[PDB]
């Protein structure tokens, strides 16, 4: 039975991915006046399948140079931690319920990296050489900030795991008492995603593509299948952790819901955004973090310190 | 908000560590017979 | 184990050279091959079968003194009436020294080793006699 | 399962084997990667979890960096893998066949010792507190901001300095 | 050394509550208030003398104390109790907040028909006295006798003897 | 360096020996060797030269895999007994590691080829704390367990370092290293004492560390670092060589001189534990230092060698270095015999 | 545990042998000291966890924080000398036999 | 420690977690215990030296508890018992052994 | 400094905010009615067990039963 | 056992897709196709060349903030302590001394990209 729920908790985030992709198309070309995707099945339903089965069929190349065992482990260990790190999410009640959920999804997303670093140096060619030394700067600049935002909002639920946040915004949003944050730890899941305005690893502009331009077909279509998949986990764990949906012992099926729709109004965002402004540049983007959330972040950290002892309000554990 | 909802989350959490407290001695004398039973189990087959 | 060494004083000397030459042909070899790890770990030679060939030569070398001490020794031992006399360890070690001088093709190596293995023999058997302790234990 | 942590702790002592052994730094990383998810999956079945976690967290920044570090200087037009050197190519399958053999001898002249593989796995836990709820690892290692508040002193200054000192030293 | 003493299978045979981890939890704060004599002697003789093997006698009246507990309930408040936990085990972690509704009718059930009365949220966790005649067990640990002290130098300073008596130092 | 790094760097290194003298845990000792090891390199790789920078990487290798040796010792212990600090039940390989570290930390041989490289590369200011106060926390650890160790083991060390101090003096030229190699053969006589009697080691420490400190003042006056420079003072600044003679005699180990009380005293205790072999051999090897002592004092001081033309630029202008310390300490160094029976 | 510590303490034998013979890079020196730093923490972790000393676990994460120091200051110094010598090559690093 | 900082000020920087008997966080004592704490108050006063041939029964306890290395022997010979009697034929596992018991509360 | 300070809040407002929010940070605390209750909160869950004392006849203040009304009591906190 | 069945469930989905990709398409291999990419003009150099690396001192310092983020974390269950004055006045200390670091790098231009 845990092998269909299993099922159930895969197959439709894979979907949900695959249909990520038209939805981002359909909106920014309704965003910039045009139809996008529309003669492919009706209303453009099948392009993501199109698109899938002609990457698989297409040659995958392996190019001489390159270095066939960190050349074929990259993709697959991308893929296997996006779709890994949906396991402990509570929605409402989490497939694996880990009591340091929130360090364990710290753990996954810092070895996701690994995938672009080592597929970059795998590729042995320049433009891989850039994409994987942007990637590692990238790093370097969001996951400073990351763990202390985490640290802060966590300060008010007492404990690292993620259902005990269904109980702490039972009567509240987590967004009022740390908007300040939520925004901070917004733009820093943009960084994770590696998406714009952070797109600096892959950024088509700059090097032809990043750390993907030798991959091609299936090995190539693994990278894209969990940036989108790592989009909508992302804006899940901001859903559950900020903007809290209802849970009603009663009745699961409305955090379900709820969650539902506040996940799919934020990854709507991140498309908006995408189409609404222009990118980054590597250094620009390290200089903001270190220079203008790491000291307010590091004051809001002592901030929530202090908030439970001079208001008495000390989470409780368990 | 937080301040008065974890105050009330504080006491329940008394509450049921109270229950707690309450039921330990039925589980101590229980875990005394069981360990007890187990250890004299095994000393009867390393007899044999 | 450290038997073999400490059976060197079993019995008295002049009797069991054979075995006794065994041991102490086993104890020269020994520090001979510490000597050529040394000696190679540092100050590497060009090839590796340079470096072997260094450390046969050593290894042999420090075998072939220790061997003729102990014959030495145990022979004078023997053929003379005095079984605990230091001259006959301090004869060994003239002969070790010798051996050396051979083995390295110089003369001046030949008379000071024997000078010097010849004294540090007779010490040690000295020191077995008297009771002397090397590497004591605190006492105070 | 019985052979669960057995198998752990070889297939660390097999990672660190092949870290000896040095090919490429980034090699090196990746095996120092694949050893440090095995320590961390060794606590976690010694009843830990805190500190696995956070050996695996900081392992990873840690070899990210290293890595940004090595494209950069530790690098080479051909860099040598586990298998591009015949020698450690030889020396880790010695190494390994070595480790087995060496198990088999420690078993063998101690049945018990050192090794135990006949009842291995029966002595992985030895007590727990059934009825607790406080006794996880977290609040031992929090302890440090009540009852060995020195242990933070120092820590803290450690890294403090270590500012000043790496900026003193890249001058 | 000595052969262990473990009490004989019959010696730990007792009636046994055989009523699940809900059902306890629903009775668990009048439990606690009725049955605390019982208990707590209990209590005291398990952390007086250390030994499992020296409490099993009031372990039993423990048990005992339960069973006529739980028999009085089901005599009375028998189906307002079976709803009240049967709501408790449906949640979760059992949690106390899901189920205030029914926990009033069994409590105001309980209260006129039997005249218990629940304790409030600081009642159960305070230190209380307990009333023994088994006596206090001396040398617990069976501890050995501790070796005596080194004979203490008493006595009244003086001068060195010849001053530093330093080779040829005349002080 | 600005003023802040160096209250910072010059705190963390008077910090870390003060942590590992005071600390009851062996956890805390270690750290205190880190605090030295990390805060002692910027000040070596100050000068920013080649020569400086691999002086450094030398010294960060060695002594990390020295910390490394020392920290599994002390894990093992505490797997062992459940402690942090070495009882006397104590595994005596874990003991034999401690000692084999410490001695890589400071320096003795076999594992004394990195200390020579290292002084030589580094300016004299820092060889000054080099050697001398960075050996007091090491040897505070050793002090601290001194009644377990072992006494092979600790006696091999030192009769090596002694015979090899004494055999490396001889060849150098470069005074950094020359002194290098007199702390290789003071330590190993402060190692051969330590198991016998930690009061005499730690006499021995005191007396090399007054006398070191002002010679490497001497040689920081005219930044002397060779023979033939230190040969020169004659003319730049003729006052010192008296005592420069003196205190080389007395680092050497003359009778009237104070350094004789160090090794007379260690020789008496080791005669008293009836280690008559191992206090022979010292005592004769302990005469090259002599030797190599008594060419530089030939060199400088009853000998006058070739000067330059323009030392006398150097005679025209003034000089304000020498400190009131270096009076004190070396006339307290070089004078003070009489007063032996107080020290010991 | 006796197994486990058996096979932590010939892993960090290992390392430490790796680390006393060099191959070229100091690099790979670097992250063979950083193996030894993870098995000993390994071993504290476990021996702290067996003996249930909740006082002994702020010990692993102190000896994290001087380790993470000193590899950091490690790294400086690969910095420094391959500004110097063009590599990392410990070859380079022979000017002080003189 | 080399100079007594701390006893000479009265703090107590370090000198409270150097044993497993020590206080723990909410009052979860360490795994021997008891076998700790009867070695070191019998050590207490005497010397390590004479600790160490006076109280030697102590700590042979607190080692065993510690490392249990008897323990593990006796298990390794009763189970090594077990299997050859088993493979000879001679012994049967009993049912609460086996797989199948009444399970106690 | 009115002038650096009024140039600061618009110029760099990131760290004037940081710098403000670390003084309350550390200001607050001390002054709250509230701090106090923290400390005896944490002390009012009962995580272990409450081990009772024998009672030598002489023990006048701890209670014989919980729900007498000797000992601590948690009023305050159910009325913070 | 849960979380290692659907661990090696995701690993074998991934596997079994990489597998397809690698034996389902028709391949033709030769050496121009497989040759390195440069924008259409062959690679003037290896890219295993030295490769500078701009931004070498804040990637140390993140070593050392990232080990102050572990000694932080421990903080939520810090927090359910009885010495909370003390808690707070480490938290407090430790905190500024992460931003008097960061404070001093920026100002000594740590943070400013190497050229
Ligand atoms: C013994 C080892 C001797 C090593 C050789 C030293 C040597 O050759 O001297 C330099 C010599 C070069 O002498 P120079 O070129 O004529 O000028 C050097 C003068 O200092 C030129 O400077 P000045 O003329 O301005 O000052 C002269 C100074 C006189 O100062 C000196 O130059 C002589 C100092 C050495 C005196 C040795 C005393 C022997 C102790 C016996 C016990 O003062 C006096 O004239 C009388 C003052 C009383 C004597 C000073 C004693 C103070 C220190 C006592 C410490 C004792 C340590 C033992 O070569
Ligand atoms: C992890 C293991 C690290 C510890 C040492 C491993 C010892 C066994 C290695 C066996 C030899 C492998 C080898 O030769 O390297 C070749 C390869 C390099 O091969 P290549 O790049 O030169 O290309 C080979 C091309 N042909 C096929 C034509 C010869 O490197 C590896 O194998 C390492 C891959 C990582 C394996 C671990 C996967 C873990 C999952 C990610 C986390
Ligand atoms: C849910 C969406 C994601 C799904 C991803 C998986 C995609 C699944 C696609 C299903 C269709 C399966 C058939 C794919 C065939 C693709 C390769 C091909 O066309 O080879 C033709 C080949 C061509 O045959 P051929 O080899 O004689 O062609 C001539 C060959 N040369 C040029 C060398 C002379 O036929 C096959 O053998 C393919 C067998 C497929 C089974
Ligand atoms: C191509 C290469 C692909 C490589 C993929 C690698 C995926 C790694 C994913 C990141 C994992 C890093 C974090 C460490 C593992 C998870 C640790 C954890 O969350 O806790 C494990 C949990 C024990 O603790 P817990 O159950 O939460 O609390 C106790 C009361 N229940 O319960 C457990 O003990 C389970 C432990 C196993 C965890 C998963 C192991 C996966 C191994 C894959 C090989
Ligand atoms: C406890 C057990 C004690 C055993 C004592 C064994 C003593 C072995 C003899 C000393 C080893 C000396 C190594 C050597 O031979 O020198 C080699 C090298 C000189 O170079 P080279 O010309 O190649 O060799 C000539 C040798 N006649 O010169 C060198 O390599 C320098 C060696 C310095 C370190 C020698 C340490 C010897 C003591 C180690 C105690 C541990
Ligand atoms: C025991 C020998 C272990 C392996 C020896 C490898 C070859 C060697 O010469 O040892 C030193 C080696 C550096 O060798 P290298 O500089 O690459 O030059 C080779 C010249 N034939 O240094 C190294 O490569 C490090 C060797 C570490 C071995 C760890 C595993 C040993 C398992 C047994």
């Given at each position: ?313 000390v989470?409780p554990y368990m | ?9 504080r006491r329940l959490l008394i509450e049921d560590l109270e229950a707690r407290i309450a039921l330990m001695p039925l589980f101590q004398a229980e875990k005394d017979r069981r360990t007890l039973q187990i250890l004299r189990e095994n000393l009867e087959e390393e007899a044999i | ?140 | ?45 010694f009843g830990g979890s805190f ?71 029966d002595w992985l836990m030895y007590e727990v507190d059934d009825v607790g709820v406080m006794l996880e690892g977290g609040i031992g290692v929090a302890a440090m901001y009540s009852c060995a508040t020195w242990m ?20 | 050394p000595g052969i262990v003493e473990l009490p004989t299978l019959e010696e730990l045979k007792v009636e046994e509550v055989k009523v699940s981890s809900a059902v306890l939890k629903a009775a668990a704060h009048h439990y606690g208030a009725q049955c605390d004599k019982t208990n707590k002697e209990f209590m005291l003789c398990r952390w007086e003398e250390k030994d499992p093997r020296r409490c099993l006698k009031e372990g039993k009246l423990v048990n005992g104390c339960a069973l006529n507990f739980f028999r009085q309930i089901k005599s009375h408040c028998?189906?307002?109790f079976?709803?009240?936990w049967?709501?408790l085990?449906?949640?979760?972690m059992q949690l106390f ?6 926990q009033?009718?069994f409590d105001?059930?309980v209260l006129?028909k039997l005249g218990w009365v629940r304790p409030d949220l600081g009642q159960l966790s305070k230190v209380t006295k307990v009333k023994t005649d088994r006596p206090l067990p001396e040398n617990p640990y069976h501890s050995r006798a501790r070796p005596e002290p080194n004979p203490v130098i008493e ?17 | ?22 600390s009851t845990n062996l956890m805390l ?48 212990n505490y797997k062992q007994l459940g402690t942090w600090m070495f009882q006397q039940q104590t595994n ?55 009644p ?197 | 545990m006796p ?41 504290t972790s476990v021996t702290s966890l067996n003996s249930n000393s909740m006082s002994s676990m702020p010990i ?39 | 420690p080399?100079?007594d900082?701390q006893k000479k000020l009265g703090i107590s920087l370090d000198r409270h977690f150097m044993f497993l008997s020590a206080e723990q966080p909410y009052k979860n004592a360490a795994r021997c215990h008891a076998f700790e704490k009867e070695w070191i108050e019998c050590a207490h006063g005497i010397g390590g030296t004479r600790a160490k041939k006076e109280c030697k029964i102590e700590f042979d306890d607190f080692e065993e508890c510690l490392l249990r290395y008897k323990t593990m022997r006796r298990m390794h010979d009763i ?15 009993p049912?609460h052994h086996?797989?199948?018991e009444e399970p106690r509360p | ?35 106090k209750y923290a400390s005896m909160i944490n002390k009012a869950t009962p995580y272990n067990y409450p081990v009772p004392v024998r009672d030598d006849g002489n023990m006048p203040d701890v209670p014989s039963h919980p729900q007498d009304p000797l000992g601590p009591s948690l009023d305050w906190l159910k009325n913070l | ?73 421990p903080?939520?269950w810090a927090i359910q302590t009885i010495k909370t004055s003390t808690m ?28």
């Amino acid at each position: 039975m845990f092998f269909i729920n299993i099922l159930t908790l895969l197959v439709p985030i894979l979907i949900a991915m695959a249909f990520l992709t038209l939805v981002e198309r359909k909106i920014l070309g309704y965003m910039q006046l045009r139809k996008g995707p529309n003669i492919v099945g009706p209303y453009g339903i099948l392009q993501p399948f199109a698109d899938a089965m002609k990457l698989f069929m297409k040659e995958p190349m392996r190019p001489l140079t390159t270095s066939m065992s960190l050349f074929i482990i990259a993709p697959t260990l991308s893929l296997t931690l996006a779709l890994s790190l949906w396991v402990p999410l509570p929605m409402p009640h989490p497939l694996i319920n880990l009591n340091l959920g929130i360090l364990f999804i710290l753990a996954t997303s810092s070895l996701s990296v690994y995938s672009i670093l080592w597929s970059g140096w795998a590729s042995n060619s320049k433009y891989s050489l850039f994409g994987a030394l942007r990637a590692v700067a990238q790093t370097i600049s969001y996951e400073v900030t990351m763990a202390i935002i985490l640290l802060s909002v966590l300060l008010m639920n007492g404990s690292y795991s993620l259902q005990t946040l269904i109980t702490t915004q039972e009567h509240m949003w987590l967004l009022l008492p740390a908007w300040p944050m939520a925004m901070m730890w917004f733009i820093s899941t943009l960084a994770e995603t590696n998406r714009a305005p952070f797109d600096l690893t892959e950024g088509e502009s700059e090097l032809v593509s990043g750390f993907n331009v030798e991959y091609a077909a299936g090995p190539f279509a693994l990278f894209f299948m969990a940036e989108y998949t790592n989009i909508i986990l992302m804006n899940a764990l901001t859903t559950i952790i900020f903007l809290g949906p209802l849970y009603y012992i009663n009745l699961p099926e409305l955090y379900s819901t709820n969650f539902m729709m506040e996940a799919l109004l934020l990854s709507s965002t991140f498309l908006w955004i995408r189409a609404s402004y222009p990118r980054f540049r590597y250094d620009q983007l390290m200089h903001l973090l270190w220079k203008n959330f790491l000291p307010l972040t590091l004051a809001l950290c002592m901030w929530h310190i202090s908030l439970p002892i001079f208001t008495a309000g000390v989470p409780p554990y368990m | 908000r937080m301040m008065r909802w974890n105050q009330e989350r504080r006491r329940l959490l008394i509450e049921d560590l109270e229950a707690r407290i309450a039921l330990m001695p039925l589980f101590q004398a229980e875990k005394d017979r069981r360990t007890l039973q187990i250890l004299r189990e095994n000393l009867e087959e390393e007899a044999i | 184990v450290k038997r073999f060494f400490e059976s060197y004083h079993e019995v008295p000397d002049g009797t069991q050279c054979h075995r006794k030459t065994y041991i102490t042909t086993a104890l020269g070899g020994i520090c001979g091959i510490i000597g050529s790890a040394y000696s190679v770990s540092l100050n590497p030679a060009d090839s590796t079968l340079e470096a072997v060939a260094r450390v046969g030569r050593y290894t042999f070398t420090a075998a072939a003194i220790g061997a003729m001490f102990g014959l030495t020794t145990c022979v004078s031992a023997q053929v003379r009436e005095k079984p605990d006399d230091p001259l006959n360890y301090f004869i060994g070690g003239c002969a070790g020294g010798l051996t050396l001088g051979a083995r390295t093709h110089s003369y001046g190596t030949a008379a000071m080793g024997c000078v010097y293995m010849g004294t540090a023999a007779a010490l040690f058997k000295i020191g077995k006699l008297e009771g002397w302790e090397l590497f004591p234990t605190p006492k105070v | 399962m019985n052979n669960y942590i057995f198998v752990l702790s070889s297939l660390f002592l097999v990672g660190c084997l092949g870290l000896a052994l040095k090919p490429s730094p980034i090699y090196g990383g990746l095996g120092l990667i694949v050893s440090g998810f095995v320590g961390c999956l060794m606590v976690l079945g010694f009843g830990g979890s805190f500190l696995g976690l956070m050996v695996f967290l900081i392992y990873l920044g840690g070899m990210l960096v290293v890595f940004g570090y090595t494209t950069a200087m530790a690098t080479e037009e051909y860099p040598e893998t586990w298998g591009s050197n015949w020698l450690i190519l030889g020396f880790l399958v010695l190494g390994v066949i070595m480790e087995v053999f060496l198990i088999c001898v420690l078993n063998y002249y101690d049945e018990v010792g050192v090794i135990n593989l006949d009842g291995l796995g029966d002595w992985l836990m030895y007590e727990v507190d059934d009825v607790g709820v406080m006794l996880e690892g977290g609040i031992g290692v929090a302890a440090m901001y009540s009852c060995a508040t020195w242990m933070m002193v120092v820590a803290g200054w450690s890294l403090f300095a270590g500012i000043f000192i790496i900026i003193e030293i890249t001058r | 050394p000595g052969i262990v003493e473990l009490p004989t299978l019959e010696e730990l045979k007792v009636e046994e509550v055989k009523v699940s981890s809900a059902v306890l939890k629903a009775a668990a704060h009048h439990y606690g208030a009725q049955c605390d004599k019982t208990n707590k002697e209990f209590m005291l003789c398990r952390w007086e003398e250390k030994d499992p093997r020296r409490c099993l006698k009031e372990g039993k009246l423990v048990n005992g104390c339960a069973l006529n507990f739980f028999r009085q309930i089901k005599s009375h408040c028998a189906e307002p109790f079976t709803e009240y936990w049967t709501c408790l085990d449906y949640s979760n972690m059992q949690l106390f907040r899901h189920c205030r509704q029914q926990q009033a009718k069994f409590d105001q059930c309980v209260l006129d028909k039997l005249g218990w009365v629940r304790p409030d949220l600081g009642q159960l966790s305070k230190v209380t006295k307990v009333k023994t005649d088994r006596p206090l067990p001396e040398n617990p640990y069976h501890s050995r006798a501790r070796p005596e002290p080194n004979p203490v130098i008493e006595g009244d300073l003086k001068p060195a003897k010849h001053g530093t008596r330093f080779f040829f130092w005349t002080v | 360096m600005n003023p802040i790094t160096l209250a910072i760097i010059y705190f963390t290194i008077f910090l870390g020996p003060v942590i590992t003298m005071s600390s009851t845990n062996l956890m805390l000792m270690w750290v205190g060797l880190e605090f030295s090891l990390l805060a002692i390199i910027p000040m070596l790789i100050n000068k920013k030269n080649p020569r400086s920078t691999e002086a450094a990487t030398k010294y960060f290798v060695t002594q990390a895999t020295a910390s490394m040796i020392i920290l599994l010792a002390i894990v093992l212990n505490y797997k062992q007994l459940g402690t942090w600090m070495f009882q006397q039940q104590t595994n005596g390989l874990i003991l034999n590691m401690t000692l084999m570290a410490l001695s890589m930390k400071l320096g003795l041989a076999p594992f004394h080829f990195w200390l020579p490289e290292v002084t030589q590369g580094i300016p004299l200011h820092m060889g000054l704390i080099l050697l001398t106060w960075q050996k007091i926390a090491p040897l505070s650890i050793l002090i601290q367990i001194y009644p377990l160790l072992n006494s092979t083991i600790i006696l091999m060390l030192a009769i090596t370092s002694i015979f090899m101090g004494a055999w490396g003096g001889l060849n150098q030229t470069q005074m950094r290293k020359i002194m290098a190699y007199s702390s290789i053969a003071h330590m190993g006589w402060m190692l051969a004492i330590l198991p016998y009697n930690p009061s005499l080691t730690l006499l021995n420490l005191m007396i090399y560390i007054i006398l070191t400190a002002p010679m490497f003042m001497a040689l920081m006056l005219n930044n002397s670092m060779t023979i033939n420079s230190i040969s020169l003072l004659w003319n730049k600044t003729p006052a010192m060589l008296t005592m420069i003679s003196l205190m080389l005699l007395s680092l050497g180990g003359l009778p009237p001189l104070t350094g004789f009380l160090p090794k007379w005293i260690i020789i008496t205790e080791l005669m008293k534990n009836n280690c008559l072999i191992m206090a022979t051999l010292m005592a004769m090897m302990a005469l090259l230092n002599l030797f190599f002592y008594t060419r530089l004092i030939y060199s400088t001081s009853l000998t006058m060698f070739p000067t330059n033309n323009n030392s006398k630029m150097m005679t025209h202008q003034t000089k304000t270095k020498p400190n009131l310390m270096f009076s004190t300490l070396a006339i307290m160094s070089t004078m003070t015999l009489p007063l032996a029976p107080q020290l010991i | 545990m006796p197994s486990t510590f058996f096979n932590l303490t010939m892993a960090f034998s290992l390392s430490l042998l790796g680390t006393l013979m060099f191959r070229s890079h100091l690099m790979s020196t670097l992250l063979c000291l950083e193996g030894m730093v993870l098995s000993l923490f390994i071993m504290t972790s476990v021996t702290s966890l067996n003996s249930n000393s909740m006082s002994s676990m702020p010990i692993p994460i102190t000896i994290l924080v001087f380790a993470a120091c000193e590899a950091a200051v490690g790294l400086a110094l690969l910095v420094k000398v391959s500004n110097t010598y063009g590599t990392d090559y410990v070859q380079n690093l022979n000017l002080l036999q003189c | 420690p080399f100079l007594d900082i701390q006893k000479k000020l009265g703090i107590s920087l370090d000198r409270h977690f150097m044993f497993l008997s020590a206080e723990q966080p909410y009052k979860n004592a360490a795994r021997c215990h008891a076998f700790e704490k009867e070695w070191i108050e019998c050590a207490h006063g005497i010397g390590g030296t004479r600790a160490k041939k006076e109280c030697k029964i102590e700590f042979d306890d607190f080692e065993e508890c510690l490392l249990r290395y008897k323990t593990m022997r006796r298990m390794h010979d009763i189970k090594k018992q077990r299997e050859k009697l088993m493979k000879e034929g001679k012994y049967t596992p009993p049912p609460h052994h086996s797989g199948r018991e009444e399970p106690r509360p | 400094i009115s002038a650096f300070l009024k140039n600061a809040w618009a110029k760099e407002p990131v760290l004037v905010v940081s710098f403000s929010v670390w003084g309350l940070a550390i200001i607050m605390p001390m002054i709250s009615p509230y701090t106090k209750y923290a400390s005896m909160i944490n002390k009012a869950t009962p995580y272990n067990y409450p081990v009772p004392v024998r009672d030598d006849g002489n023990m006048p203040d701890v209670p014989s039963h919980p729900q007498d009304p000797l000992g601590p009591s948690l009023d305050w906190l159910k009325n913070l | 056992m849960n979380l290692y069945t659907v661990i090696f469930i995701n690993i074998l989905l991934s596997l079994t897709l990489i597998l397809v990709a690698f034996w389902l398409p028709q391949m033709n291999l030769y050496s121009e196709k497989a040759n390195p990419y440069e924008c259409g003009f062959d690679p003037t150099s290896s890219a295993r060349l030295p490769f500078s690396m701009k931004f070498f001192l804040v990637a140390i310092t993140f070593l050392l903030f990232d080990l102050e983020i572990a000694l932080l974390l421990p903080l939520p269950w810090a927090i359910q302590t009885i010495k909370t004055s003390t808690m707070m006045i480490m938290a407090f200390i430790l905190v500024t001394i992460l931003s008097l670091g960061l404070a001093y790098e920026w100002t000594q231009k740590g943070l400013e990209w190497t050229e």
